[PDB]
Structure formats: C-alpha cells, structure tokens
Design a protein around this ligand. Sequence first.
Ligand SMILES: OC[C@H]1O[C@H](O[C@H]2[C@@H](O)[C@H](O)[C@@H](CO)O[C@@H]2O)[C@@H](O)[C@@H](O)[C@@H]1O
Ligand SMILES: OC[C@H]1CNC[C@@H](O[C@H]2O[C@H](CO)[C@@H](O)[C@H](O)[C@H]2O)[C@@H]1O
Ligand code: MG
Length: 358
Amino acid sequence: LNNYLHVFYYSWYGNPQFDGKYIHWNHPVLEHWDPRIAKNYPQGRHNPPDDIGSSFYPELGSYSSRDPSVIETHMRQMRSASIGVLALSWYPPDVNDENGEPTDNLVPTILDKAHKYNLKVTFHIEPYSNRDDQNMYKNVKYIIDKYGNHPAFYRYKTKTGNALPMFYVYDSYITKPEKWANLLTTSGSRSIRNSPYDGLFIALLVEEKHKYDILQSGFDGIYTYFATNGFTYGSSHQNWASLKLFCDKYNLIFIPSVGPGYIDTSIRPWNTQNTRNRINGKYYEIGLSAALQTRPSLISITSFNEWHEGTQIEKAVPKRTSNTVYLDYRPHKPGLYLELTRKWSEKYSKERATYALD
Ligand SMILES: OC[C@H]1O[C@H](O[C@H]2[C@@H](O)[C@H](O)[C@@H](CO)O[C@@H]2O)[C@@H](O)[C@@H](O)[C@@H]1O
Ligand SMILES: OC[C@H]1CNC[C@@H](O[C@H]2O[C@H](CO)[C@@H](O)[C@H](O)[C@H]2O)[C@@H]1O
Ligand SMILES: [Mg+2]
C-alpha cells in the first residue's frame, strides 16, 4: 500500500433508500453568469437513476455515500489501486456544499471502513462561507480532537518518528495571506504551530503568483488539484518542474495532482474548453509520468469519485438511455483506472525508495 499516494474522495452522494431523496446525482445544471448564454443550454436538476449529473455512469449506480457496502467497495478499489490514503472532501458539521447535505456525520463510518482495509483518511477542507483563520482554528481543533485518535486517521510519518495531520485547503487563495499567517506562522496571533494541533497545511496553487502568497501565509505545501492540463498554471504539467524547484528552495511539500481526464458538461455545459478525452488511459499515464519525473514527496489523484467533473477512477460502466449514450472505459474493463493506478503506484513506490539521501 503506497502511503505517499493520496486520492480525492467525495462522500456527498445520496439516494432515496438511504437518504430519503437523491443527493448530487440529481445535480442542477449550473447557470452561466450571463443568462443570455445560459438560456441556450440545458437547465434544472438531473433525474436519477437513468439521468444523472455525470458524463459517466458508476458500476454502483446512483449510490449512497452512506451505504456501508458502497464505502467498502470504495475502500477495496483504492486498496487494489495501491492507494494508501483518501483525502476526504469535508465541510464543518451542519454545513454543506451548495448542492448537497452535511457530510461530517459520515466521517466515523468512513474511518472504520478505511481501517478495515489498512487505509488512511486525511482531510480536504472545502471553501465554506466565511472560512477564515478564526473558524479554521476551530475546525482544525475539531478534526484532531474527534478523529485524531482513530487508527485510520492519516498522519504524515517523518523518519524522525513525528506524525503530523495533513489538511488540503481547497481555494485557499480566497482568504488573504495576512489572515492565514495568524494561524500558520510561528508568532501569528492564533498560531497552531508547536501546539498539539499542529499539522501540514497544503495550499491550492492556481496562478503562478500564488507561490508568493503561499510563502507569506505560512503553508507547508502546495497542490494543484485540477485534472485539466492547461486550465491553470498549476494544472499544466509543463510547469511542474518549476513548482518542484520552488518548493525545494522553500522547504514546501510539492503535491502535484494527476487526473485521468475531465468532462463536466452535464452540469457546466458552457465549460467544453476544459474537456479532456481519456484516450483509453493514455491521458492518465502522461500525467502520472510527468508527476513521477519531478520526484515529488507525494502525489495526489483527482479523483476517486468526482463524477460531475468526469475525473473519477472509480469503476464506471456502459449505459445508454432513450436520449443519452454515457461515456465509459470501453474497450477496457470498468477497473481500467484502478489497474493503471496500481501499475504507476508500484513504479512510484520503488522509485521513491531511491530518492532518499541515505
Ligand atoms: O468555472 C469552471 C471551473 O469551476 C471550478 O473551479 C472554480 C474555482 O474553485 C477555482 O479555484 C477556479 C480556478 O481558476 O476556477 C473556478 O472558479 C471547477 O469545477 C473547474 O474544474 C471548472 O473548470
Ligand atoms: O473538492 C474540491 C472541488 C472539486 N470540484 C467540485 C467543487 O465543488 C463544486 O462543484 C461541484 C460540482 O462539480 C458542486 O456539486 C459543489 O457544490 C461545488 O462547491 C469542489 O469544491
Ligand atoms: Mg525536512
């Protein structure tokens, strides 16, 4: 199991049988900012189970994230891909993404199932409204006190035997560096540095200029998230050598994010510019290769199951309805991306063993 390979995981899917209604599968079409443009595209919520807010269709159907057999299947798949860690999309208790319901209540269950498969769970902190240094302090504390003693709680284990929580902070650039510095610098007014609540905070780099903001904020690392090559400076793998060099100079953990493709046009029909064909696994393999070449301390995978954005490596199956032919992994099997991950994970694991100065 490769503990240096992290995958972005989403627990926001629901169905009537487990949640009392569809959640996320019935995603609305997101309106373009200009309503003159939006009026020429589809509108309203998708209608599961045959019409979902994805360009692909899961082997598990319009599943519930809260179904314990679904969680087990997911853990099996990640273990068989040789992924050691899932980075769980997270909102604070009683808060949720704008298209979903609260998910913090499910964390204990996900931890238990992860433990069953020797997997670890870290946290991908989403941009909840009014997220700032004050409430991030409280949420970090909350996460560590509540889940920190679970044996599947992820900690980056240094060779020195220190073991630090990790937090990926999505769209961290929304909060000013002077606010972050309150939490993340040694002498910030509400610093968690050197407290029992210390950890490795990874910032999302979008634009090149964010490099500098990230230094000023006191983050420990950078990640790039987006699966589309060319969408941002960070998501373009031509720039990963430079980011790696920068991170090395400044003692930051570089975590490039690699994806198998992208397509979100079931929910963002205006966003065809960022669509990337999977090329029967070759897009993913080019990403994985480009990441391995930078000799990174960790690699992240976008994603296990962001089905709206078509970046999932979770098992997908052919499906045709009266008006839709879903995308799929034909001519390969539903486990294609799991197999390709296992291959590159073992390369990365063997190569990463020879990075060390000792
Ligand atoms: O606009 C489409 C775009 O939206 C989402 O990402 C948003 C935000 O979270 C990102 O930080 C910035 C990066 O420039 O872009 C958007 O504002 C994603 O769903 C993305 O894949 C999509 O293309
Ligand atoms: O986890 C980081 C990031 C990944 N992409 C989706 C982002 O959420 C946003 O878009 C989805 C649809 O793709 C919506 O369902 C969410 O409400 C919205 O916040 C997510 O933050
Ligand atoms: Mg060091």
